[PDB]
Amino acid sequence: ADTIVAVELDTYPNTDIGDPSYPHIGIDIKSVRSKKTAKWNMQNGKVGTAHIIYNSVGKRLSAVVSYPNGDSATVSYDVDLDNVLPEWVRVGLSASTGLYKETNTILSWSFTSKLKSNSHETNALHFMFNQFSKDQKDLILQGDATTGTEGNLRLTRVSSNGSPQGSSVGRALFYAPVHIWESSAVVASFEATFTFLIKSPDSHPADGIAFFISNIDSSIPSGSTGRLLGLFPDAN
Amino acid sequence: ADTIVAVELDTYPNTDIGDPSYPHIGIDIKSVRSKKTAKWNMQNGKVGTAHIIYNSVGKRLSAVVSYPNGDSATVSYDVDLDNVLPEWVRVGLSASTGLYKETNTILSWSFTSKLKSNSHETNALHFMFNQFSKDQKDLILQGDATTGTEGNLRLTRVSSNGSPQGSSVGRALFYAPVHIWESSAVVASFEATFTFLIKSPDSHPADGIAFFISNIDSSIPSGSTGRLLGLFPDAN
Amino acid sequence: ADTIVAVELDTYPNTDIGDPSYPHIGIDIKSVRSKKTAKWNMQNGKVGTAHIIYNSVGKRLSAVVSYPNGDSATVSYDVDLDNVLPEWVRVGLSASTGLYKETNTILSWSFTSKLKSNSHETNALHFMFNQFSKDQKDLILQGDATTGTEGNLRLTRVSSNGSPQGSSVGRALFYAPVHIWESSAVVASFEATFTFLIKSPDSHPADGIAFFISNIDSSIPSGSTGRLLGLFPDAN
Amino acid sequence: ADTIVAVELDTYPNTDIGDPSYPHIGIDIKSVRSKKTAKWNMQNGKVGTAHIIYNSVGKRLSAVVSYPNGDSATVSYDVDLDNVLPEWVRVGLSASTGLYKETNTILSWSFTSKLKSNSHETNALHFMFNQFSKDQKDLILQGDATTGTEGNLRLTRVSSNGSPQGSSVGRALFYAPVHIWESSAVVASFEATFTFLIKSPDSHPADGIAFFISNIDSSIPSGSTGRLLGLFPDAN
Numbered sequence: 001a002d003t004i005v006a007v008e009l010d011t012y013p014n015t016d017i018g019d020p021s022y023p024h025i026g027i028d029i030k031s032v033r034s035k036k037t038a039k040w041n042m043q044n045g046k047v048g049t050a051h052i053i054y055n056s057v058g059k060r061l062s063a064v065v066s067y068p069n070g071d072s073a074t075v076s077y078d079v080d081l082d083n084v085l086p087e088w089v090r091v092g093l094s095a096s097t098g099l100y101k102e103t104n105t106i107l108s109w110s111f112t113s114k115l116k117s118n119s120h121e122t123n124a125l126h127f128m129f130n131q132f133s134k135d136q137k138d139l140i141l142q143g144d145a146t147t148g149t150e151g152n153l154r155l156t157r158v159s160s161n162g163s164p165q166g167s168s169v170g171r172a173l174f175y176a177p178v179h180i181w182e183s184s185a186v187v188a189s190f191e192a193t194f195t196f197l198i199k200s201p202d203s204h205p206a207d208g209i210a211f212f213i214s215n216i217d218s219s220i221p222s223g224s225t226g227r228l229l230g231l232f233p234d235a236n
Numbered sequence: 237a238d239t240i241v242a243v244e245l246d247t248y249p250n251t252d253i254g255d256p257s258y259p260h261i262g263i264d265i266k267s268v269r270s271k272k273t274a275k276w277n278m279q280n281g282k283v284g285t286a287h288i289i290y291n292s293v294g295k296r297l298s299a300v301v302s303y304p305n306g307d308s309a310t311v312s313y314d315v316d317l318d319n320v321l322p323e324w325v326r327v328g329l330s331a332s333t334g335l336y337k338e339t340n341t342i343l344s345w346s347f348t349s350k351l352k353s354n355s356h357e358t359n360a361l362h363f364m365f366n367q368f369s370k371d372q373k374d375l376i377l378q379g380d381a382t383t384g385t386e387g388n389l390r391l392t393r394v395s396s397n398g399s400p401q402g403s404s405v406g407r408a409l410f411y412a413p414v415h416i417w418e419s420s421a422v423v424a425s426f427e428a429t430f431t432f433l434i435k436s437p438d439s440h441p442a443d444g445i446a447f448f449i450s451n452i453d454s455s456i457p458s459g460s461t462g463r464l465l466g467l468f469p470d471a472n
Numbered sequence: 473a474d475t476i477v478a479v480e481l482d483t484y485p486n487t488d489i490g491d492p493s494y495p496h497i498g499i500d501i502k503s504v505r506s507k508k509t510a511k512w513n514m515q516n517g518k519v520g521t522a523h524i525i526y527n528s529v530g531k532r533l534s535a536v537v538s539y540p541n542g543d544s545a546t547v548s549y550d551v552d553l554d555n556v557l558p559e560w561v562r563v564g565l566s567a568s569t570g571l572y573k574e575t576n577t578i579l580s581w582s583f584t585s586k587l588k589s590n591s592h593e594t595n596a597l598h599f600m601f602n603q604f605s606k607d608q609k610d611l612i613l614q615g616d617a618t619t620g621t622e623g624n625l626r627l628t629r630v631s632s633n634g635s636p637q638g639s640s641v642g643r644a645l646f647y648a649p650v651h652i653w654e655s656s657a658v659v660a661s662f663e664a665t666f667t668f669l670i671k672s673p674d675s676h677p678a679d680g681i682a683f684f685i686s687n688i689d690s691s692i693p694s695g696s697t698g699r700l701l702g703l704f705p706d707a708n
Numbered sequence: 709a710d711t712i713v714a715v716e717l718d719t720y721p722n723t724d725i726g727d728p729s730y731p732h733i734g735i736d737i738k739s740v741r742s743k744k745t746a747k748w749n750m751q752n753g754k755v756g757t758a759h760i761i762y763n764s765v766g767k768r769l770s771a772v773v774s775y776p777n778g779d780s781a782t783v784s785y786d787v788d789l790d791n792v793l794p795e796w797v798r799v800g801l802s803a804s805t806g807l808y809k810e811t812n813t814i815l816s817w818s819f820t821s822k823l824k825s826n827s828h829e830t831n832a833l834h835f836m837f838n839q840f841s842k843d844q845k846d847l848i849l850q851g852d853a854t855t856g857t858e859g860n861l862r863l864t865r866v867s868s869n870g871s872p873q874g875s876s877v878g879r880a881l882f883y884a885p886v887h888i889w890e891s892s893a894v895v896a897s898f899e900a901t902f903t904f905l906i907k908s909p910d911s912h913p914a915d916g917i918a919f920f921i922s923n924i925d926s927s928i929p930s931g932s933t934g935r936l937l938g939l940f941p942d943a944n
């Protein structure tokens with residue numbers, strides 16, 4: 001059912017479904033098998049930042065994930081998202097654990113969409129969360145996601161003693177639909193930034209965090225924990 | 237039930253409920269009887285712009301409505317909106333006709349809310365509509381409001397032949413709730429701008445347009461057409 | 473001397489120096505011979521909008537020029553501007569006439585540069601001119617450029633009777649240097665938008681308008697009127 | 709000569725020139741004797757944030773200074789800055805030490821000015837420094853001010869061993885002039901935010917930090933160290 005465009009921060013190589021044999025960032029267009037990936041060194045317990053950038057002019061969905069020591073991974077993929085997404089969408093963040101686990105803590109998330117037509121006629125949506133609240137009424141939380149008093153978005157279950165749990169899936173979508181393209185726009189652009197804290201005591205962290213764009217009514221697909229990152233009903 | 241803070245562009249003097257005896261802009265806090273007004277020369281058939289500005293520092297809700305020839309009216313009112321509004325709100329635009337009538341056409345609407353805490357931790361919501369679409373999924377339309385193909389928001393009924401109808405009420409609220417204050421914010425500010433086209437063939441235009449802030453579940457009060465501008469169940 | 477990156481709106485095909493045999497938009501990196509062009513139908517006397525977009529992630533300089541009837545031309549070019557430009561620059565607008573002529577009237581110009589590092593540490597510059605004033609102290613006007621009372625930037629000479637003159641060159645650069653890249657930035661992006669009105673009574677319009685980025689001390693090169701668009705000392 | 713509007717973070721009570729007998733924030737219009745002040749508990753060695761807000765609608769210059777534990781001081785003052793400032797200005801930050809001393813370290817500074825006319829015609833300037841660089845070409849440094857490799861703006865002299873020096877004055881002004889009012893603007897607003905770190909080993913910290921607005925050619929007045937905060941030739 002859902003149509004998904006996602007940038008995944010994939011901490012666990014599932015080499016039997018396309019993953020390269022390392023942690024990676026990837027651009028996912030309607031499939032968990034990334035159309036493009038790049039090797040990503042996830043820094044356990046460090047606060048990372050992902051930036052996702054698209055414009056309809058260059059038609060390049062780009063993402064960069066960095067940590068404070070400056071190591072970064074970038075992935076870009078040429079794609080015309082007008083042909084992929086419906087005109088109205090919701091944007092959100094998703095994360096998973098499976099057999100292995102990790103905290104999928106989002107510390108901030110910002111997003112901007114703009115449709116520039118002809119002629120000083122722009123429609124724009126911008127939000128920025130640097131602090132999430134307990135009762136975050138402009139966010140739709142799905143599955144295991146929760147917003148804490150500590151001001152974070154915990155996309156997957158973390159135990160009272162601070163421990164990430166396995167087989168968790170959770171997503172947070174901005175409440176308002178976004179008009180991410182409009183056929184008379186000369187420029188439809190968006191950008192998204194989030195900061196995250198992936199920490200694991202496990203033998204390996206898993207499974208990752210994705211920023212995604214979906215149909216407005218998108219919900220977690222059945223059994224999308226683990227390697228499917230809460231975005232896809234399957235690994236096709 | 238609803239809690240309303242509004243800036244009204246009031247085209248019709250209802251002198252028996254507080255209006256001054258002229259068209260006016262006013263600041264309405266939980267009552268249609270404006271706490272403060274200023275004489276406003278509505279320019280029939282011209283495109284006006286209203287700007288509404290509040291910050292929690294100066295605690296002054298300010299509004300200015302202007303037309304291209306530069307005539308403008310300003311109203312300011314000292315008020316602590318933390319004590320008025322709930323923490324989460326919806327923001328919107330409302331307009332009415334009663335016995336007299338006018339087009340209450342909104343050509344653009346923009347809004348920004350920011351909560352600045354301590355410490356480069358800001359939450360922000362910004363939207364901008366310069367063109368409304370027919371199926372405007374990030375707007376909640378109430379009552380007679382409609383968004384047209386022409387890219388406008390018609391808050392009240394306009395006849396197929398372009399004529400405004402009487403006894404109309406309509407509102408458009410942004411879909412996402414807004415967090416307009418948060419007690420640990422050092423600055424909670426917002427601003428709103430809209431452009432409007434009030435045209436009437438009537439002996440007098442009525443009744444006006446308001447930008448308002450309300451509880452998230454706000455709906456048009458019963459019999460709020462006319463002088464109550466779709467905001468208030470009564471003239472108290 | 474100068475280093476120039478430019479998006480040109482080139483109204484005159486100078487086929488002996490690389491131009492294609494039509495009006496075109498092009499991306500110029502250190503040469504007037506565009507690395508990339510696209511056919512552009514200049515609409516005489518209509519107000520056009522150009523949008524220029526770059527990010528250091530996708531490393532794609534993109535431009536689109538459109539008119540209100542929606543005809544548009546787009547050009548994109550993969551390039552790493554960190555390797556082209558100095559770290560600090562000035563940004564501006566340039567236009568020329570030669571043997572043929574045209575008004576090169578800019579009605580608005582906006583620009584944003586951002587350097588996003590690690591870690592909610594962004595440097596940003598944004599300006600927007602929708603109205604230029606006579607004494608525009610945040611603009612550096614070179615050559616024939618002038619800002620009028622009418623609120624426009626006339627990059628090339630227009631006669632008192634409204635007529636564009638030949639052999640004119642003029643540029644307007646934003647006063648403050650811009651830091652358009654910084655090697656520790658994870659994202660260095662910029663965007664620029666301007667609206668323009670190219671009108672000509674001539675047998676052909678010429679020569680065009682460019683948005684450019686240059687070294688801070690950039691000045692009009694000698695004999696850069698006409699086909700060199702006020703950017704290049706020569707056609708190499 | 710200079711015309712100064714300033715918000716001062718005044719760490720040292722100079723009770724013989726108007727200061728109240730405590731550290732205070734104040735709004736200074738053409739005089740170091742603040743038109744309005746508020747008691748401010750400066751938290752030695754903590755990172756503070758000041759927010760300064762003005763709009764020409766409400767005509768209230770407002771400032772709030774806060775620290776992460778949430779203690780804050782606010783000051784507001786009704787004033788029409790169109791009658792005070794010239795139309796074009798420079799904006800900057802100033803700080804002083806005298807007999808007592810303190811670090812006057814600025815960690816970030818952001819500013820926005822907007823002139824909204826009639827009719828989707830806004831001029832705007834926004835800058836944001838979250839990191840200052842050594843060679844900060846869009847800043848004018850005066851007196852003792854320096855930008856470090858550490859990414860801070862040290863408005864006053866700090867010794868190689870980290871110690872603030874006495875009798876220091878330094879200012880940083882944004883390079884481009886700002887058009888802070890224009891008589892046909894319906895709204896002329898600005899806001900400024902900076903974060904600062906005032907640390908002192910002294911028996912008392914002194915003298916403070918100001919954000920100011922001045923004539924474009926403003927320079928440090930002779931003998932404006934200490935209680936005059938680098939803004940005023942005297943205490944009148």
Ligand SMILES: Nc1ncnc2[nH]cnc12
Pocket residue numbers: 013014015016017227
């Ligand atoms: N370790 C793994 N490699 C490939 N595909 C998988 N699916 C689940 N676990 C996997």
Ligand SMILES: Nc1ncnc2[nH]cnc12
Pocket residue numbers: 249250251252253463
């Ligand atoms: N003309 C009017 N004056 C005062 N109050 C009113 N209520 C309805 N019409 C009115």
Ligand SMILES: Nc1ncnc2[nH]cnc12
Pocket residue numbers: 485486487488489699
């Ligand atoms: N018409 C033209 N074609 C090619 N190059 C030129 N240089 C000057 N005019 C020219």
Ligand SMILES: Nc1ncnc2[nH]cnc12
Pocket residue numbers: 721722723724725935
């Ligand atoms: N301590 C102080 N009190 C008042 N004015 C002053 N000027 C210099 N030092 C002072």
Ligand SMILES: [Ca+2]
Pocket residue numbers: 010011012013014019207227
């Ligand atoms: Ca995986």
Ligand SMILES: [Ca+2]
Pocket residue numbers: 246247248249250255443463
């Ligand atoms: Ca009324």
Ligand SMILES: [Ca+2]
Pocket residue numbers: 482483484485486491679699
């Ligand atoms: Ca040419």
Ligand SMILES: [Ca+2]
Pocket residue numbers: 718719720721722727915935
């Ligand atoms: Ca003092």
Ligand SMILES: [Mn+2]
Pocket residue numbers: 008010018019020024026032034
């Ligand atoms: Mn993957």
Ligand SMILES: [Mn+2]
Pocket residue numbers: 244246254255256260262268270
């Ligand atoms: Mn009224």
Ligand SMILES: [Mn+2]
Pocket residue numbers: 480482490491492496498504506
């Ligand atoms: Mn060319």
Ligand SMILES: [Mn+2]
Pocket residue numbers: 716718726727728732734740742
């Ligand atoms: Mn003082």
